[PDB]
Amino acid sequence: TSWSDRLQNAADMPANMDKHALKKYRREAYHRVFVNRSLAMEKIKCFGFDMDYTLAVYKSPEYESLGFELTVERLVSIGYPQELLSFAYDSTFPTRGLVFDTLYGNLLKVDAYGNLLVCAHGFNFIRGPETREQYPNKFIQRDDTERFYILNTLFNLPETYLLACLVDFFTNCPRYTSCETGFKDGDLFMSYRSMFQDVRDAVDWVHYKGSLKEKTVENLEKYVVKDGKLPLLLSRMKEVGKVFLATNSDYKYTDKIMTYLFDFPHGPKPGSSHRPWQSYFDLILVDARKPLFFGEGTVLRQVDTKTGKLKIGTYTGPLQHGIVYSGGSSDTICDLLGAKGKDILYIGDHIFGDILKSKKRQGWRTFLVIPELAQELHVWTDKSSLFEELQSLDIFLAQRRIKKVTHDMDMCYGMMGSLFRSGSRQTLFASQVMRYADLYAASFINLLYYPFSYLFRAAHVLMPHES
Amino acid sequence: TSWSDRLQNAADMPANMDKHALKKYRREAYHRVFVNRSLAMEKIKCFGFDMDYTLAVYKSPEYESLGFELTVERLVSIGYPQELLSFAYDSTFPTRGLVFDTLYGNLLKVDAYGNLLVCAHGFNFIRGPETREQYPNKFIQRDDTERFYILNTLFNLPETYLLACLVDFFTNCPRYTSCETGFKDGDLFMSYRSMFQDVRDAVDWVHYKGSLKEKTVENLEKYVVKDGKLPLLLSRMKEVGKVFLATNSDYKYTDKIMTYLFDFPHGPKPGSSHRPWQSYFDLILVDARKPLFFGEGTVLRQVDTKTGKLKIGTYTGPLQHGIVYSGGSSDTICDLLGAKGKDILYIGDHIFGDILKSKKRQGWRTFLVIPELAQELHVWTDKSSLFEELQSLDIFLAQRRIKKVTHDMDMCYGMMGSLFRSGSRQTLFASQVMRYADLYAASFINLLYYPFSYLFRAAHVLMPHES
Ligand SMILES: [Mg+2]
Ligand SMILES: [Mg+2]
């Protein structure tokens, strides 16, 4: 099964708010909130939510497969070869947080320090010695954003795989000659960089100018996890604080998704009257443009909720009941809900644009949703054997077996391994989760299972000379 | 006593290279190398050294007091008031790694996340509630380099204290009216920012156009720690690898300092012939301009070692015996010593310009010298009681006593507390040591006490969900 299967299984369950049931439930990994830094919930005055891959978790592999399919069609449409059409999305290939090197056309799994853990060129996994040809120090300068692109979001799962399909196809298609930095077809040269830009633009185009959204919304059961405990959680938050939505997506789409998310015969709990999704929020903001939202932002606009268009002009009014904002900045939230950054818990899946940025620019408290965790956890438990074997093989040498066992652990997760590590080496992703997510979970719903008085605790950190 | 007292005490001792003596010596905190990330020394092919506050550790408080005294004289010289002349350097005030806020004229001790641990305005320590006036979220955006300056080096110890003297003097001098962002004297307005720039320029001027260097070199016993084990360590490194000097300072100064550093009746060991400092290095480079050195660098020049001037032109030749370089880049070192970044251990005291930058830009291995550690360690041991009391007071509540005990621990270190923490809260400095220094010690000489085969080990890191 998939991580969205695990999530949706848990979603289909009623909430048993009996306090002993709660305590028991959240000691189970699947339902636990994990803590990187201590957070006293009683201090949180505003709970803020992201929408895509946070409140609205898209079913896998269905959604990735749709995105891939329409990206490929867009590319064939602009003149890429018909062979593309025979590609089919494969969920066992891509892991999130990979770096596409646009110079050399490789996918890299790196650690926090730019060190190379895995290198695939198409579907060929390049081993240690061979990577030194292009990476003399087995290292990339990942801030070199012109050359290196980090495929940080679940939205990038289909393109991670498509990049590899395309490198593989051109490499092995006799019409094209492979060169260091791209492919020659007679008098046309396609660099990996230009190829990469096309894929990137086509993904954007599918989400913005194409048919992805329309196809999602016309079959919401197929594409979006739904959970009757969402209204319960939000109603409970609203009892102790303020709740807000801040989404990069536009009004029309947010309304269709959010309406689905709340589409039950009842309100917070079974038996209670249904109420519109907007009622659960003290402030609703779309077209956020995160991460820029956490700095200068853009001009504050007001949505005409009847037409779905923006009113003409900058909005200069106060928080009214029923107003929906567009644009603005993180200061809009603070000022209008009368909060300081440390009074806000923002909940989101984008490690960069939701968590890193809110934490560094603004000192918000952060909760990261990691939808893959719901399944990464089952693997970590079931194959704790291998990791233990590896753990123990590092102490006995304190070599070829370290390498063989690493590969066997990593393969259980997929061709590109755990989101969090390659053997004993932690990924950039893992290290940024630890660095900037105060709390993290497989789902935001795991907060339901903790009283609002709860103190999420982490042990104090000590330097080597201090221990 | 001072940290340089501790260092010089250890320096005055001969090396007992008996292997059992070695093992014993380095288990003592003062002589230990501390490990943030595992490092196999057998992999290191080049050992690179910084000079100022690394090889050449300046005696405290003598050196800071000299710098302060000449900075103050420079300022009076350009028209600051004669009262400045009655200031005298006080070593118990400043801690390294403070942030001067140029808007409000405060010194801040912050954590990795910009959270405020201490705020002093002149010598007035502003408590929790009062800091919310200027810092509504008790937080600064430390990347806002136009507003916030981090006083990261031992060279900045005198200016940290001078900033506070000056804020205190203008505040309490009846000629000046204190405003939010600076001081009014009739028709002249002095912002904290313009004041700060003057101090900063005057420090630069003292080091570059003034008399600090001349006064150092005319009394090297007073101002610079010297240790007969330096040549031993370097000779031993040269047996297993290549040794290089890369200093921001110029040739003439480097030669006077380095000659002092090696001024013993003997060479590597007692009884052996003395040899010139340059003989210990496979590559010597001055005017490095770190951190830019770790990127594009500057043009490679060759020093005329007879005149102390640079030859005219870019140097296009190979590594020759006896050549001294100026400028260039980190690639100069790699290319000319035929090394890759992970074959280099660079040793230095500048957390930013030596360690952070070499690690992020180039993947060098890093050893940070923390000269204050030689004394920070004695306090941590002797007052382990207080920290233990605090440690234990955090678990019993798992408040006013947490706060009172924090202050008593921090005061043992100075008015601005440990370099590494304020109570249980770790400083930005501490967190960057952990993040970018693979190894660290109170002195580079602590490497002497470890065989070159040694494996510096750190335990593998696990995420909360993995433990
Ligand atoms: Mg999202
Ligand atoms: Mg230095």
PDB file of N, CA and C in Angstrom, chain B residues 21-104:
ATOM      1  N   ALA B  21      51.716   8.675  27.780  1.00  0.00           N
ATOM      2  CA  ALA B  21      51.619  10.072  28.198  1.00  0.00           C
ATOM      3  C   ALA B  21      50.637  10.786  27.286  1.00  0.00           C
ATOM      4  N   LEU B  22      50.742  10.530  25.986  1.00  0.00           N
ATOM      5  CA  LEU B  22      49.826  11.155  25.023  1.00  0.00           C
ATOM      6  C   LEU B  22      48.341  10.860  25.315  1.00  0.00           C
ATOM      7  N   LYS B  23      48.017   9.569  25.440  1.00  0.00           N
ATOM      8  CA  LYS B  23      46.654   9.065  25.702  1.00  0.00           C
ATOM      9  C   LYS B  23      46.030   9.674  26.963  1.00  0.00           C
ATOM     10  N   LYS B  24      46.848   9.786  28.005  1.00  0.00           N
ATOM     11  CA  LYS B  24      46.447  10.341  29.287  1.00  0.00           C
ATOM     12  C   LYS B  24      46.124  11.838  29.175  1.00  0.00           C
ATOM     13  N   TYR B  25      47.012  12.554  28.485  1.00  0.00           N
ATOM     14  CA  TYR B  25      47.019  14.006  28.408  1.00  0.00           C
ATOM     15  C   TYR B  25      45.755  14.561  27.736  1.00  0.00           C
ATOM     16  N   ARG B  26      45.368  13.899  26.650  1.00  0.00           N
ATOM     17  CA  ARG B  26      44.284  14.313  25.784  1.00  0.00           C
ATOM     18  C   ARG B  26      42.907  13.860  26.296  1.00  0.00           C
ATOM     19  N   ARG B  27      42.857  13.040  27.344  1.00  0.00           N
ATOM     20  CA  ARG B  27      41.566  12.785  27.990  1.00  0.00           C
ATOM     21  C   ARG B  27      41.177  13.977  28.886  1.00  0.00           C
ATOM     22  N   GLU B  28      42.177  14.783  29.306  1.00  0.00           N
ATOM     23  CA  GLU B  28      41.940  16.049  30.029  1.00  0.00           C
ATOM     24  C   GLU B  28      41.322  17.098  29.095  1.00  0.00           C
ATOM     25  N   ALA B  29      40.278  17.786  29.569  1.00  0.00           N
ATOM     26  CA  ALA B  29      39.452  18.645  28.710  1.00  0.00           C
ATOM     27  C   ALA B  29      40.297  19.657  27.963  1.00  0.00           C
ATOM     28  N   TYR B  30      41.289  20.206  28.681  1.00  0.00           N
ATOM     29  CA  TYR B  30      42.131  21.331  28.209  1.00  0.00           C
ATOM     30  C   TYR B  30      42.983  20.968  26.991  1.00  0.00           C
ATOM     31  N   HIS B  31      43.224  19.673  26.837  1.00  0.00           N
ATOM     32  CA  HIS B  31      44.094  19.133  25.819  1.00  0.00           C
ATOM     33  C   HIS B  31      43.397  18.237  24.813  1.00  0.00           C
ATOM     34  N   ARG B  32      42.057  18.186  24.872  1.00  0.00           N
ATOM     35  CA  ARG B  32      41.237  17.320  24.038  1.00  0.00           C
ATOM     36  C   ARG B  32      40.849  17.987  22.695  1.00  0.00           C
ATOM     37  N   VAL B  33      40.746  17.212  21.619  1.00  0.00           N
ATOM     38  CA  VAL B  33      40.088  17.702  20.411  1.00  0.00           C
ATOM     39  C   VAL B  33      38.617  17.184  20.461  1.00  0.00           C
ATOM     40  N   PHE B  34      37.632  18.091  20.271  1.00  0.00           N
ATOM     41  CA  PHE B  34      36.225  17.742  20.383  1.00  0.00           C
ATOM     42  C   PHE B  34      35.646  17.530  18.968  1.00  0.00           C
ATOM     43  N   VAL B  35      34.654  16.661  18.827  1.00  0.00           N
ATOM     44  CA  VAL B  35      34.230  16.161  17.488  1.00  0.00           C
ATOM     45  C   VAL B  35      32.746  16.424  17.327  1.00  0.00           C
ATOM     46  N   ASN B  36      32.366  17.103  16.238  1.00  0.00           N
ATOM     47  CA  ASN B  36      30.971  17.313  15.906  1.00  0.00           C
ATOM     48  C   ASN B  36      30.540  16.305  14.864  1.00  0.00           C
ATOM     49  N   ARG B  37      31.465  15.988  13.954  1.00  0.00           N
ATOM     50  CA  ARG B  37      31.250  14.997  12.906  1.00  0.00           C
ATOM     51  C   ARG B  37      32.484  14.099  12.838  1.00  0.00           C
ATOM     52  N   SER B  38      32.283  12.813  12.548  1.00  0.00           N
ATOM     53  CA  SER B  38      33.413  11.894  12.503  1.00  0.00           C
ATOM     54  C   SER B  38      34.397  12.314  11.419  1.00  0.00           C
ATOM     55  N   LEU B  39      35.689  12.200  11.734  1.00  0.00           N
ATOM     56  CA  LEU B  39      36.769  12.555  10.827  1.00  0.00           C
ATOM     57  C   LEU B  39      37.913  11.532  10.995  1.00  0.00           C
ATOM     58  N   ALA B  40      38.194  10.821   9.906  1.00  0.00           N
ATOM     59  CA  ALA B  40      39.301   9.899   9.843  1.00  0.00           C
ATOM     60  C   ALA B  40      40.564  10.648   9.435  1.00  0.00           C
ATOM     61  N   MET B  41      41.465  10.890  10.372  1.00  0.00           N
ATOM     62  CA  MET B  41      42.687  11.657  10.068  1.00  0.00           C
ATOM     63  C   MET B  41      43.547  11.079   8.945  1.00  0.00           C
ATOM     64  N   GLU B  42      43.477   9.760   8.766  1.00  0.00           N
ATOM     65  CA  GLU B  42      44.262   9.090   7.740  1.00  0.00           C
ATOM     66  C   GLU B  42      43.880   9.544   6.327  1.00  0.00           C
ATOM     67  N   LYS B  43      42.631   9.966   6.176  1.00  0.00           N
ATOM     68  CA  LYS B  43      42.159  10.593   4.963  1.00  0.00           C
ATOM     69  C   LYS B  43      42.704  12.039   4.703  1.00  0.00           C
ATOM     70  N   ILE B  44      43.172  12.733   5.728  1.00  0.00           N
ATOM     71  CA  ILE B  44      43.626  14.114   5.512  1.00  0.00           C
ATOM     72  C   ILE B  44      45.006  14.108   4.842  1.00  0.00           C
ATOM     73  N   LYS B  45      45.117  14.758   3.693  1.00  0.00           N
ATOM     74  CA  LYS B  45      46.384  14.853   2.970  1.00  0.00           C
ATOM     75  C   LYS B  45      47.075  16.197   3.132  1.00  0.00           C
ATOM     76  N   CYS B  46      46.287  17.265   3.334  1.00  0.00           N
ATOM     77  CA  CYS B  46      46.775  18.631   3.591  1.00  0.00           C
ATOM     78  C   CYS B  46      46.197  19.234   4.845  1.00  0.00           C
ATOM     79  N   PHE B  47      47.077  19.796   5.676  1.00  0.00           N
ATOM     80  CA  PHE B  47      46.699  20.510   6.842  1.00  0.00           C
ATOM     81  C   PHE B  47      46.934  21.971   6.524  1.00  0.00           C
ATOM     82  N   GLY B  48      45.899  22.790   6.619  1.00  0.00           N
ATOM     83  CA  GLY B  48      46.059  24.200   6.315  1.00  0.00           C
ATOM     84  C   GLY B  48      45.824  25.020   7.558  1.00  0.00           C
ATOM     85  N   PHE B  49      46.582  26.099   7.709  1.00  0.00           N
ATOM     86  CA  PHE B  49      46.509  26.903   8.905  1.00  0.00           C
ATOM     87  C   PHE B  49      46.149  28.358   8.628  1.00  0.00           C
ATOM     88  N   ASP B  50      45.355  28.908   9.523  1.00  0.00           N
ATOM     89  CA  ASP B  50      45.202  30.379   9.582  1.00  0.00           C
ATOM     90  C   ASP B  50      46.262  30.866  10.542  1.00  0.00           C
ATOM     91  N   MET B  51      46.566  32.171  10.520  1.00  0.00           N
ATOM     92  CA  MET B  51      47.585  32.749  11.416  1.00  0.00           C
ATOM     93  C   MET B  51      47.021  33.496  12.556  1.00  0.00           C
ATOM     94  N   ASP B  52      46.286  34.566  12.349  1.00  0.00           N
ATOM     95  CA  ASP B  52      45.874  35.435  13.507  1.00  0.00           C
ATOM     96  C   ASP B  52      44.830  34.724  14.379  1.00  0.00           C
ATOM     97  N   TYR B  53      45.100  34.641  15.698  1.00  0.00           N
ATOM     98  CA  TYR B  53      44.237  33.956  16.649  1.00  0.00           C
ATOM     99  C   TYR B  53      44.104  32.459  16.377  1.00  0.00           C
ATOM    100  N   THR B  54      45.062  31.961  15.585  1.00  0.00           N
ATOM    101  CA  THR B  54      45.193  30.529  15.392  1.00  0.00           C
ATOM    102  C   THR B  54      46.589  30.115  15.739  1.00  0.00           C
ATOM    103  N   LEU B  55      47.563  30.437  14.898  1.00  0.00           N
ATOM    104  CA  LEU B  55      48.951  30.088  15.208  1.00  0.00           C
ATOM    105  C   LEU B  55      49.515  31.107  16.191  1.00  0.00           C
ATOM    106  N   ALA B  56      49.094  32.354  15.951  1.00  0.00           N
ATOM    107  CA  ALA B  56      49.486  33.523  16.699  1.00  0.00           C
ATOM    108  C   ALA B  56      48.306  33.911  17.552  1.00  0.00           C
ATOM    109  N   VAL B  57      48.279  33.441  18.808  1.00  0.00           N
ATOM    110  CA  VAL B  57      47.182  33.778  19.713  1.00  0.00           C
ATOM    111  C   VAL B  57      47.604  34.958  20.565  1.00  0.00           C
ATOM    112  N   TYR B  58      46.816  36.035  20.508  1.00  0.00           N
ATOM    113  CA  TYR B  58      47.244  37.250  21.139  1.00  0.00           C
ATOM    114  C   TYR B  58      46.869  37.240  22.599  1.00  0.00           C
ATOM    115  N   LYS B  59      47.859  37.507  23.438  1.00  0.00           N
ATOM    116  CA  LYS B  59      47.665  37.595  24.887  1.00  0.00           C
ATOM    117  C   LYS B  59      46.543  38.565  25.326  1.00  0.00           C
ATOM    118  N   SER B  60      45.676  38.076  26.199  1.00  0.00           N
ATOM    119  CA  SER B  60      44.567  38.810  26.778  1.00  0.00           C
ATOM    120  C   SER B  60      44.835  39.103  28.284  1.00  0.00           C
ATOM    121  N   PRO B  61      44.351  40.259  28.833  1.00  0.00           N
ATOM    122  CA  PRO B  61      43.681  41.347  28.088  1.00  0.00           C
ATOM    123  C   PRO B  61      44.580  42.338  27.383  1.00  0.00           C
ATOM    124  N   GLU B  62      45.902  42.161  27.459  1.00  0.00           N
ATOM    125  CA  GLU B  62      46.882  43.055  26.849  1.00  0.00           C
ATOM    126  C   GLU B  62      46.551  43.468  25.426  1.00  0.00           C
ATOM    127  N   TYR B  63      46.371  42.500  24.526  1.00  0.00           N
ATOM    128  CA  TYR B  63      46.117  42.845  23.161  1.00  0.00           C
ATOM    129  C   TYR B  63      44.779  43.601  22.990  1.00  0.00           C
ATOM    130  N   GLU B  64      43.667  43.078  23.561  1.00  0.00           N
ATOM    131  CA  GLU B  64      42.372  43.790  23.442  1.00  0.00           C
ATOM    132  C   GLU B  64      42.506  45.264  23.966  1.00  0.00           C
ATOM    133  N   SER B  65      43.196  45.395  25.087  1.00  0.00           N
ATOM    134  CA  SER B  65      43.381  46.676  25.724  1.00  0.00           C
ATOM    135  C   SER B  65      44.181  47.644  24.811  1.00  0.00           C
ATOM    136  N   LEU B  66      45.227  47.145  24.160  1.00  0.00           N
ATOM    137  CA  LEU B  66      45.915  47.930  23.153  1.00  0.00           C
ATOM    138  C   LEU B  66      44.989  48.372  22.009  1.00  0.00           C
ATOM    139  N   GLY B  67      44.317  47.425  21.352  1.00  0.00           N
ATOM    140  CA  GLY B  67      43.382  47.744  20.277  1.00  0.00           C
ATOM    141  C   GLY B  67      42.359  48.801  20.640  1.00  0.00           C
ATOM    142  N   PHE B  68      41.738  48.650  21.817  1.00  0.00           N
ATOM    143  CA  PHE B  68      40.740  49.585  22.407  1.00  0.00           C
ATOM    144  C   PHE B  68      41.293  50.974  22.582  1.00  0.00           C
ATOM    145  N   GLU B  69      42.443  51.032  23.253  1.00  0.00           N
ATOM    146  CA  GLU B  69      43.197  52.267  23.484  1.00  0.00           C
ATOM    147  C   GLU B  69      43.487  53.005  22.181  1.00  0.00           C
ATOM    148  N   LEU B  70      44.000  52.320  21.168  1.00  0.00           N
ATOM    149  CA  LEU B  70      44.208  52.994  19.848  1.00  0.00           C
ATOM    150  C   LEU B  70      42.957  53.310  19.033  1.00  0.00           C
ATOM    151  N   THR B  71      41.928  52.466  19.119  1.00  0.00           N
ATOM    152  CA  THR B  71      40.613  52.808  18.547  1.00  0.00           C
ATOM    153  C   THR B  71      40.073  54.100  19.196  1.00  0.00           C
ATOM    154  N   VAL B  72      40.144  54.206  20.511  1.00  0.00           N
ATOM    155  CA  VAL B  72      39.603  55.378  21.197  1.00  0.00           C
ATOM    156  C   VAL B  72      40.377  56.612  20.745  1.00  0.00           C
ATOM    157  N   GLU B  73      41.687  56.486  20.643  1.00  0.00           N
ATOM    158  CA  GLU B  73      42.498  57.635  20.236  1.00  0.00           C
ATOM    159  C   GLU B  73      42.202  58.086  18.807  1.00  0.00           C
ATOM    160  N   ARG B  74      42.034  57.135  17.905  1.00  0.00           N
ATOM    161  CA  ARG B  74      41.579  57.428  16.554  1.00  0.00           C
ATOM    162  C   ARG B  74      40.265  58.230  16.564  1.00  0.00           C
ATOM    163  N   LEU B  75      39.260  57.736  17.292  1.00  0.00           N
ATOM    164  CA  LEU B  75      38.000  58.448  17.392  1.00  0.00           C
ATOM    165  C   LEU B  75      38.144  59.868  17.972  1.00  0.00           C
ATOM    166  N   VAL B  76      38.876  60.030  19.070  1.00  0.00           N
ATOM    167  CA  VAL B  76      39.050  61.387  19.606  1.00  0.00           C
ATOM    168  C   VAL B  76      39.705  62.213  18.533  1.00  0.00           C
ATOM    169  N   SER B  77      40.699  61.630  17.865  1.00  0.00           N
ATOM    170  CA  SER B  77      41.416  62.293  16.754  1.00  0.00           C
ATOM    171  C   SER B  77      40.521  62.874  15.627  1.00  0.00           C
ATOM    172  N   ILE B  78      39.412  62.190  15.328  1.00  0.00           N
ATOM    173  CA  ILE B  78      38.484  62.650  14.281  1.00  0.00           C
ATOM    174  C   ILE B  78      37.334  63.536  14.833  1.00  0.00           C
ATOM    175  N   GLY B  79      37.365  63.801  16.151  1.00  0.00           N
ATOM    176  CA  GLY B  79      36.430  64.743  16.796  1.00  0.00           C
ATOM    177  C   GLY B  79      35.411  64.261  17.828  1.00  0.00           C
ATOM    178  N   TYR B  80      35.472  62.973  18.196  1.00  0.00           N
ATOM    179  CA  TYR B  80      34.705  62.461  19.351  1.00  0.00           C
ATOM    180  C   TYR B  80      35.271  63.132  20.609  1.00  0.00           C
ATOM    181  N   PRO B  81      34.440  63.290  21.654  1.00  0.00           N
ATOM    182  CA  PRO B  81      34.815  64.067  22.820  1.00  0.00           C
ATOM    183  C   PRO B  81      35.894  63.439  23.685  1.00  0.00           C
ATOM    184  N   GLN B  82      36.687  64.299  24.300  1.00  0.00           N
ATOM    185  CA  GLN B  82      37.774  63.910  25.167  1.00  0.00           C
ATOM    186  C   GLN B  82      37.396  62.937  26.253  1.00  0.00           C
ATOM    187  N   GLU B  83      36.132  62.880  26.691  1.00  0.00           N
ATOM    188  CA  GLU B  83      35.759  61.900  27.732  1.00  0.00           C
ATOM    189  C   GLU B  83      36.136  60.486  27.347  1.00  0.00           C
ATOM    190  N   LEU B  84      36.079  60.173  26.057  1.00  0.00           N
ATOM    191  CA  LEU B  84      36.500  58.846  25.564  1.00  0.00           C
ATOM    192  C   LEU B  84      37.819  58.435  26.195  1.00  0.00           C
ATOM    193  N   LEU B  85      38.745  59.395  26.306  1.00  0.00           N
ATOM    194  CA  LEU B  85      40.088  59.097  26.834  1.00  0.00           C
ATOM    195  C   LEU B  85      40.062  58.531  28.266  1.00  0.00           C
ATOM    196  N   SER B  86      39.013  58.789  29.038  1.00  0.00           N
ATOM    197  CA  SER B  86      38.981  58.227  30.397  1.00  0.00           C
ATOM    198  C   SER B  86      38.425  56.767  30.424  1.00  0.00           C
ATOM    199  N   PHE B  87      37.982  56.216  29.265  1.00  0.00           N
ATOM    200  CA  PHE B  87      37.512  54.784  29.161  1.00  0.00           C
ATOM    201  C   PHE B  87      38.728  53.911  29.324  1.00  0.00           C
ATOM    202  N   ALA B  88      38.588  52.722  29.898  1.00  0.00           N
ATOM    203  CA  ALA B  88      39.689  51.766  29.986  1.00  0.00           C
ATOM    204  C   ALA B  88      39.078  50.431  29.749  1.00  0.00           C
ATOM    205  N   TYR B  89      39.789  49.597  29.002  1.00  0.00           N
ATOM    206  CA  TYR B  89      39.267  48.313  28.599  1.00  0.00           C
ATOM    207  C   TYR B  89      38.956  47.429  29.806  1.00  0.00           C
ATOM    208  N   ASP B  90      37.757  46.865  29.786  1.00  0.00           N
ATOM    209  CA  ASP B  90      37.355  45.954  30.824  1.00  0.00           C
ATOM    210  C   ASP B  90      36.971  44.591  30.267  1.00  0.00           C
ATOM    211  N   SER B  91      37.789  43.568  30.589  1.00  0.00           N
ATOM    212  CA  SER B  91      37.650  42.253  29.966  1.00  0.00           C
ATOM    213  C   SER B  91      36.476  41.439  30.481  1.00  0.00           C
ATOM    214  N   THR B  92      35.909  41.844  31.609  1.00  0.00           N
ATOM    215  CA  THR B  92      34.753  41.128  32.187  1.00  0.00           C
ATOM    216  C   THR B  92      33.456  41.527  31.543  1.00  0.00           C
ATOM    217  N   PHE B  93      33.424  42.635  30.799  1.00  0.00           N
ATOM    218  CA  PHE B  93      32.185  43.013  30.059  1.00  0.00           C
ATOM    219  C   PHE B  93      31.852  42.148  28.821  1.00  0.00           C
ATOM    220  N   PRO B  94      32.723  42.164  27.765  1.00  0.00           N
ATOM    221  CA  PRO B  94      32.298  41.637  26.481  1.00  0.00           C
ATOM    222  C   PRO B  94      32.459  40.145  26.389  1.00  0.00           C
ATOM    223  N   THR B  95      31.454  39.507  25.792  1.00  0.00           N
ATOM    224  CA  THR B  95      31.573  38.120  25.321  1.00  0.00           C
ATOM    225  C   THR B  95      31.566  38.176  23.786  1.00  0.00           C
ATOM    226  N   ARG B  96      32.308  37.285  23.127  1.00  0.00           N
ATOM    227  CA  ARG B  96      32.321  37.223  21.665  1.00  0.00           C
ATOM    228  C   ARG B  96      30.986  36.687  21.059  1.00  0.00           C
ATOM    229  N   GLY B  97      30.649  37.149  19.841  1.00  0.00           N
ATOM    230  CA  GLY B  97      29.561  36.627  19.065  1.00  0.00           C
ATOM    231  C   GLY B  97      28.304  37.455  19.333  1.00  0.00           C
ATOM    232  N   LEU B  98      28.432  38.607  20.021  1.00  0.00           N
ATOM    233  CA  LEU B  98      27.302  39.507  20.241  1.00  0.00           C
ATOM    234  C   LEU B  98      26.871  40.167  18.925  1.00  0.00           C
ATOM    235  N   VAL B  99      25.611  40.616  18.875  1.00  0.00           N
ATOM    236  CA  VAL B  99      25.054  41.293  17.709  1.00  0.00           C
ATOM    237  C   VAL B  99      24.824  42.737  18.106  1.00  0.00           C
ATOM    238  N   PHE B 100      25.486  43.686  17.437  1.00  0.00           N
ATOM    239  CA  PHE B 100      25.134  45.092  17.642  1.00  0.00           C
ATOM    240  C   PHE B 100      23.940  45.461  16.749  1.00  0.00           C
ATOM    241  N   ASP B 101      22.841  45.867  17.371  1.00  0.00           N
ATOM    242  CA  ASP B 101      21.695  46.373  16.631  1.00  0.00           C
ATOM    243  C   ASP B 101      21.936  47.860  16.382  1.00  0.00           C
ATOM    244  N   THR B 102      22.161  48.250  15.118  1.00  0.00           N
ATOM    245  CA  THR B 102      22.516  49.637  14.772  1.00  0.00           C
ATOM    246  C   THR B 102      21.322  50.642  14.768  1.00  0.00           C
ATOM    247  N   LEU B 103      20.090  50.108  14.715  1.00  0.00           N
ATOM    248  CA  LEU B 103      18.891  50.928  14.787  1.00  0.00           C
ATOM    249  C   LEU B 103      18.815  51.477  16.189  1.00  0.00           C
ATOM    250  N   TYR B 104      18.784  50.576  17.175  1.00  0.00           N
ATOM    251  CA  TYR B 104      18.497  50.909  18.571  1.00  0.00           C
ATOM    252  C   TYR B 104      19.701  51.033  19.536  1.00  0.00           C
TER     253      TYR B 104
END
